[PDB]
Amino acid sequence: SDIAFLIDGSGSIIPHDFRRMKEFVSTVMEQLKKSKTLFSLMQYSEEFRIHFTFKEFQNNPNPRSLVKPITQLLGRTHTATGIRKVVRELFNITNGARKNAFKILVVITDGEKFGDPLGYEDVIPEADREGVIRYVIGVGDAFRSEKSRQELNTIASKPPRDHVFQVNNFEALKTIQNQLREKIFAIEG
Amino acid sequence: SDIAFLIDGSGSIIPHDFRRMKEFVSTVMEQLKKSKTLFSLMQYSEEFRIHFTFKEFQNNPNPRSLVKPITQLLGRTHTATGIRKVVRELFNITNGARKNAFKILVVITDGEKFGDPLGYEDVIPEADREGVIRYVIGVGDAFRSEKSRQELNTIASKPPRDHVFQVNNFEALKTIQNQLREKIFAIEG
Numbered sequence A, B: 001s002d003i004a005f006l007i008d009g010s011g012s013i014i015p016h017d018f019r020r021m022k023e024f025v026s027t028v029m030e031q032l033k034k035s036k037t038l039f040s041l042m043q044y045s046e047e048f049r050i051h052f053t054f055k056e057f058q059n060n061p062n063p064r065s066l067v068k069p070i071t072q073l074l075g076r077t078h079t080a081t082g083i084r085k086v087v088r089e090l091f092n093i094t095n096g097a098r099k100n101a102f103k104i105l106v107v108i109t110d111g112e113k114f115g116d117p118l119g120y121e122d123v124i125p126e127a128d129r130e131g132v133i134r135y136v137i138g139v140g141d142a143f144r145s146e147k148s149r150q151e152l153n154t155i156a157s158k159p160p161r162d163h164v165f166q167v168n169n170f171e172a173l174k175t176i177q178n179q180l181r182e183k184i185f186a187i188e189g
């Protein structure tokens, strides 16, 4: 499995909630680390940060090591654009990504996609094509609406009830590790 | 005929040539005027300025006065996003666009698309579905190759012969002036 992480570095996320976020991620990588599993991370906002590719991870496969040194981005939310860059570069052959393997994407966001030229319509359709499975963790009040949830039901793979986890706040992410974990195991064993 | 212009305001355009382009536009809108014609203007770079809308035109049908105050935006070349907006905002009924009218668009730019999240692959198609006729004018030494002009043909309608025009300097736009004018009359008569 080519398991990649897309995390929201929006400056709407207070340093420690962002601290937490970061700890969540380390933990799941260690928790899902099979032998042939690869990992990659990028930090998206208004600027886009590749912290590491599959290709790298295999010559230093240590979640605590690589997760540790990340720096927040603060800008706004270009989720769609972020998606396009995952598919477009993370999941490319020269980046470690292996062709006969499962493509998995886990997104973590705290708001709605603000000020993005692209849309889900522009990026969604090409993610399916190469067949990327998408699981979305949405965090906070921003997601309590009868429309905010739509954006989340949308970045997800179908069915959405099994791909979406609407948590209450940074702390409260520890609460779904077993879930998010077992769902990603079941599709490899 | 709902006729709209997209003028490149990038930083590579020196101020006297930016003034030359502003002249061209005023003039052509003059020459192409008829009682049923409406004109719209947008300048793009990295930012996007809608100078006058279809229905605001019909509030002060005066090319010349309307073009006078236009100051240069200074960005870089985000041409696809520009096409998008032209198509999404200007040929919008609420911005005065008429249901049974023709939709002609004239693009003028001194460069290659650069650092644009969108591809022409994401805009050309919306432009076709909405029946938008595109003419491209590529000014300067950027479209100097059997390659960069290939940008022009992609943007422009088919056959490419008829919809593309390239001139060496701004000061030469005056040369394709009469040939353009006519092209845009064979649509209507």
Ligand SMILES: [Mg+2]
Pocket (backbone or CB within 6 Å): A010, A011, A012, A013, A110, A111
């Ligand atoms: Mg946020």
Ligand SMILES: [Mg+2]
Pocket (backbone or CB within 6 Å): B008, B010, B011, B012, B013, B077, B110, B111
């Ligand atoms: Mg330029």
